[PDB]
Every structure is written in structure tokens, then in C-alpha cells.
Design a protein around this ligand. Sequence first.
Ligand code: HEM
Lengths: 38, 97, 46, 122, 122, 417
Amino acid sequence: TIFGGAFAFQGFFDVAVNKWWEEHNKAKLWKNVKGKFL
Amino acid sequence: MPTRKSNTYLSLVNSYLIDSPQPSSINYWWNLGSLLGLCLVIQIASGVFLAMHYSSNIELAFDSVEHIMRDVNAGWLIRYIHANGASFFFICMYLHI
Amino acid sequence: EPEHDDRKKWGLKALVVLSSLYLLSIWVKRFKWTPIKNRKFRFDPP
Amino acid sequence: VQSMTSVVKAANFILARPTLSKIITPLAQKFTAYAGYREMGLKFNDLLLEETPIMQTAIKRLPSELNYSRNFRILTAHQLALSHQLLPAEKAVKPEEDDNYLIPYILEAEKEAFEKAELDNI
Amino acid sequence: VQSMTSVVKAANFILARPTLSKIITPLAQKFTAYAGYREMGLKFNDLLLEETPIMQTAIKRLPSELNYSRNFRILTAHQLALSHQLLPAEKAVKPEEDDNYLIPYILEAEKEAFEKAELDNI
Amino acid sequence: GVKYTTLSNGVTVATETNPAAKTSSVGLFFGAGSRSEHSHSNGISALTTNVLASQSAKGSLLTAKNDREFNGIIAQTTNDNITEAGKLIASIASNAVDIVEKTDLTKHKQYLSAQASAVEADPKSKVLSHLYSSAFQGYSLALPTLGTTESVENLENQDSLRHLAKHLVNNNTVIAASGNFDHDKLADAIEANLKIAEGVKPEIKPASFLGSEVRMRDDTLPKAYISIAVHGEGLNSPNYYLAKVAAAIYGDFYLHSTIAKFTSPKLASIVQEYNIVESYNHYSKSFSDTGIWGYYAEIADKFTVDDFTHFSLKEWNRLSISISEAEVARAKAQVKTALAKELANSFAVTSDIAEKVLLVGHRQSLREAFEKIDAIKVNDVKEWGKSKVWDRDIVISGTGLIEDLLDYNRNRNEMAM
Ligand code: HEM
């Protein structure tokens, strides 16, 4: 019963943090840099 | 009698954590004790999750630690939790004393 | 420190969650202690 | 730990000589004022370590009115420490109310204990 | 576990019919004799599991003389078990002495408990 | 014969005339209790009523009725002497100011102060009296009905004379009666003898419930006395009888009574597993617009106060869940009998009819009350329980051996699960 809210909070915080982290570190990630070294 | 006082295990848990009559005037310095307990617990937990991947052999010890850091999922997290939790355990113990 | 990226990201998640828990615990403690914080006494012997 | 009898004996040892009383008594008064217990509504005797058979016996023999006043003072001090607030100078325990009310009973209990020890040791 | 009322009801269910009584009663007597409790100074009622609120109530409701006799029988049985020795047939509890003295009290307690449960369940 | 009569002036004469009444009583009431006082003049309503009730009676029994809301003098006499009693109180009331002006209050103040102290001595009245105040701290309803020793000692004839002139007015006064007598003869007798000054009905001073705990830990007493209650429905509330029904579900208990082991309420069976409580009493006290619903309990063991509060409050939770039809049927019947019992004595009904006529303006006979209670289903009780009990703020009072009574948070948390 409790697991529902816990999972909701986990998913919400995970998605928000991931989006913010990727946006803030954008230029420094491998995914965005690979194209230059292709 | 409430079930928390009749059952022996719940009776003990009650006597120690539920109706334990603490003085009303105790400030936050009296919460270090429980903190230390938590520290011990986490250490033990981390320690166990390190024993599952650590090798006691001298030639394999350090290499096994690096295996934990680099290859084991969350191995770095548990290793650092254990190492820094030793220091934090002693910080809590020094403030305790 | 190959885990550096993931280490700092997990640290961010942990800080967010623990800070939320800490603020909630402060609120709940000041809450539970209002009856004792606001407690008064009177002492009226003959 | 130190017997109340011993500290009273030392205090009388000093007070009997103005040469040392005139020097220490002002210092003692300033120390007690700065000790900070008065602002919490406590008297010196309230601070004494109760958890000692001699101290428990002395408390049990305390008159009803003094015992109730002491209980109220202790409760007020606990409430103040809990609320992290102090009585103003108006409500604080003035120096003259530190009457050392509990010392006579503690000394009686100490004398009884010392007499017992001295008598059974022969 | 089984309510004494239920076992008494079953026993009366059987005993009301000689067709089954004439067959089982001899077997029951032989089985009680072979049970081995009589040779230790115990009656059937002494074996009953006391640690039950109904049973504790029934014992507390027992007359003084019966209670003392039961205490002596239990003590004698414990001593015999401890000494690994048994009473001879002369000193053993005769079959006619198994009077089921405690059954009425247990049945009264069971009736009270069942009445409580029935009344509060409506 | 509940019929009402309005005199040439606005005074209403309500009489519960009924044949086969053992004795008859008449009483003049004005709606000014401790509610309509303030701390400086607290107890003046009781003092002024005692002075009036202290007047010589022509063989009648003058007694003073003092209450939070209403206050008046009641005269009890044989049915044939009721008209004399009616004319008597009109004489008492018309001459109220004159009597008080020359009256020496010193002896009466001693009697009133003695009453108030005696109330404090009795642990139940202290706990209840403190309980009512703690719920309504800051408002006039918190004042003791009979006042307090220090408050009374400052009373003076001017205080009461100001009080009577404010409250003893035609619109704020009612006349109650009961017994085997003709209504018209009593009304005519009153009209020819009652002369009182006109005035507006004083606005009833507001009061609001505030959950709080008042502890008077008294370790020299042999038993722990506690009461816990919530903001129960008061008079002129549609749930007034519903609140009483809810209280009767848990009913009363006394450990040393022959009925203890065989009484219906679930809490009674629970507490006997350890002899937790010696006596407890569930009640629904109702004022003009506010009521307090809860229980009073006396615990003869230092170590079982917390156990009782836990179980009693746990039982309250069952109002909103798992309440049985048998309990509601029992509570409905028990309240109906208790309601009828209160109205047996002619004195009791005279007080009751005065209370309703003042505080609600209309009264319901037992016929109407039985029709209302009989219609209370299990659901209606459960909705009331959720509204007024489930997770609602409690007010706690306790005087003796309170050390084991756990603090407010613990008890209050038991009100929900
Ligand atoms: C009070 C309890 C404990 C304390 C204070 C403690 C303290 C320490 C400290 C200071 C280190 C050094 C780590 C570093 O230098 O980075 C360490 C390493 C280690 N401890 Fe603990 N320890 C405790 C309990 C345990 C337990 C319960 C286990 C196993 C169940 C354990 C197993 C290990 C292992 C395997 C290492 C080395 C593994 C690695 O660093 O990769 N310890 N401990």
C-alpha cells in the first residue's frame, strides 16, 4: 500500500534530477561529444 | 494490557523506544546514542555487502577492493559508505563522550 | 574515479531526498513539541 | 562524591578567617551569579546530585512545603531548558533566596552515616 | 484446545446409545488403565491443561479440600516422575476414584464463556 | 399538559402539569449563569441566587439552581400548596433588589465559598469542573458555576445588584412548574404578584472549544481521577440525542458492582482483564450551543492509567467503524430510560423545562424524544462518530496519581488509527 507513493516519489525525483543533470552538464556528456570525434 | 506491553518482544521494544521515560529537558546532544547505533548498523550492513566481494588473501585483498570499486554494481558506494562511516562512527562517539 | 559521474548524480539525488526528509522532520518535531514548548505551570500552595 | 560535610567544613574553615573571607566571598557570589542556575528558577540545593542514598534520605525527610516548592522549581527549570528560554531578572531567583534549605538535612544524614561507619569499624 | 463442552457432548452422544457404549466403554476403561497416569497418583482431571483462562478460572473456583487433594496428587506425580518409580496397585488411584471432580467447574466456565461470545456477537 | 402561558409582560410560564406527580414545584429562572459572568464578578450569579433562595418560605422549600448557563430559585411544595409557592417566588423576585440591598452577604459568601471549596475537595467535581474550563479557556464559559474562593471574597451588593438588573428582566426570565395542579390558577396567581423591570435579553457570551490538557497531579490521593472528552453536540443541535446515544454505547462501569462482570459495554469486559479501572462514566454534557462528550474515570492503580486511556480511546474509534447494531439498540434503549429517569421528580422536570425554555426556546416531551432516538440507525451514529470523535481534538483533565497519565500527544493520537 505504501509502496505506491514511495515508487511515485522515486520515479518523479529520478526523472527530474536526470533531466536537470543532463541539461546542466549537456556539453560535457559522452552522448553529445561523440559526434565531434566521429 | 496493550499488545505492545503484553508481548515479550514488543514489551522490550516498548520499554526501550516507545514509553521509555526520558527527561523532558534533554537537548539534541542526547540523540547521538541512537545515531551511533544507526552508524553501527549501517557499517555492519556495508561490511556484509563488502564481505560478499572482498577477498581476505593478501595478494587478492587490494585487487578485490578495486574490483568492488570498478566492477561491482554500487560497489564504490558501499566501499565509501563503510570507509567514511568508520570516521563518522568515531565522530559520533567522540561527541557522545 | 570511474564512478565520478554516477557518484555525483547519486549524491545529488541523496541530498535532495535527505534535505526534504530533514525539513519535514524539523517541521514534525517542532509540531509534536508545541504542546510541551507551550506548556505552562502554576504553583498555588496555602 | 564529596561529602556535604567535608565541603561545609572547608567553607567554615575559610569563613572563620576574614583574611580569606573578604577575598573569596565576593568571588563566590560572582561565581554563583554567573553559574546561570538562578536564572532558571533553581536554588543551589536543587542542583545537588539526588541519586545517592544519603541525598535520597535527606530529600525524603524534607518538609512538605519545601518539598513542593523544590518540585515546582525543578519542573520550571526543566521547562525553561526545554524551551531554551530564561526567566528575567524580575522572575529569577534573587541571591537572598538561596537559603541552603536542604543543607541541614543532608548534614544530619551524613552525620548518621559517619556515626554508623565509625561505630561498626571498632 | 478442544472445549471440554465439546468432548462431554460427544461422550454423551455415544453413551446415549448402548449399541456404541457396550463397544467403546470397555475399550475406554482399558485405555484409561493403560494410560499409566493412575499409577502415578493422578486422576484424569489432574492431566488437563491448566494454562488456559477457562481452566485457570475453573481451578480458582475449586473447593478448598479438592484443591488441596489435587495439589498433593500433582506433587506426588512430580516426585514419582523425578524418582522414576511408580505406586503399586495398592497405592495407585483405583478406577472408581476417577470421579471427574473438575468437569462441572470447567463446564460452568465454558458455558459462561460461550454465553458471552453468543451475546456479544449479535 | 406542557402548555405555555405568556403574561401581560413577556414572561413565559411553562408548566409540565401532570396527574400522579408525588409533589409539585415552581421555580423562576433567569438565563445568567457563570456564562454571563467575568473573572472579577465570577460567582455573583450563584451568590445572588443563594440570597434570594435564603429568604423565609411559608412552609415551602426554596432551593437555588446554579448552572453554567441558567440560574434561578425553585420552590417545592405539596400539590395543594403550589399557588402559595407561586405567589412566594413572585414576592421574592419583585423584591429581589430590595432584599439584596439590605442583605448582608458575609454569611452567604462564606456559604458560597464553602460550596466552591467542597467542589474542589471532591475529585470528580474538580476534574469535571476543570475539564469544562480547559475546553473553553479564554471565554466566560470556562468560569466555575459556583465561582472560586478568591473571586467570591471580592463580591459586594453592588456587583449583584448590577447583575440582577442586567439579567433579571422579563425577556431573560422564565417560570417553570410541575405537578398535579391547574395551570390557569398558577398563571393567574403569578400575574397578580410578579412585578419585574423590562429589559432586553442579554446576548449569550460566545465560547469555543480548545483541545487542551490540565493536570493537577496529586500524589497524596488514593486513586487517579481523569476525564477525556471532545466537542460534543450541545442543546439546539440535531445530534443532541445522538451524542447521548453514543455515550450510552460505552455507558457506565464500577468494578465493585455486582453488574460489572456481566455488563454489556465492550470496554467493561476489556478493563477487567487487569482490573484497569475502578469506575468510569461516559456522559454528554450539553450547554446552550456547545457540548462536551467524553468520559470520567477513577483509577485505583498508579500503573494502569495509560492502559485505560489507550483502551477507552481505542474503543471510541469503534464509533466510526465496526459499531454493532446490538450496541446502538442497547444505547438507544438505555438513553431513553435514562432520559425518562431524569424527569421523574417534579423538581428535576422543573429545572429541565426552565433550561430548555431559556436556552432553546422550545421543549420536546418524552414522546418526541423517543420518536427521535428510535429513528437513530447505526449509520447515523457512525457519521456522528467520524464528525465529532474520529481524529477530533480531545480535552483532558486529571487530578490524582496522574504520573502515569501519558501526555496529550499520546492520548490524542489514539483518537485515530
Ligand atoms: C564498528 C564497526 C566497523 C568499523 C568502525 C570499521 C572500520 C573500517 C575502516 C576504518 C576501514 C578502512 C577503509 C578504508 O581505509 O577505506 C574498513 C574497511 C573494511 N571493513 Fe570495516 N569496520 C567495521 C565493521 C566491519 C564489518 C561488519 C565488516 C564486514 C561485515 C567490515 C569489513 C571491512 C572490509 C571488507 C573492509 C575493506 C573493504 C574495502 O575497503 O574495499 N568492517 N573498516
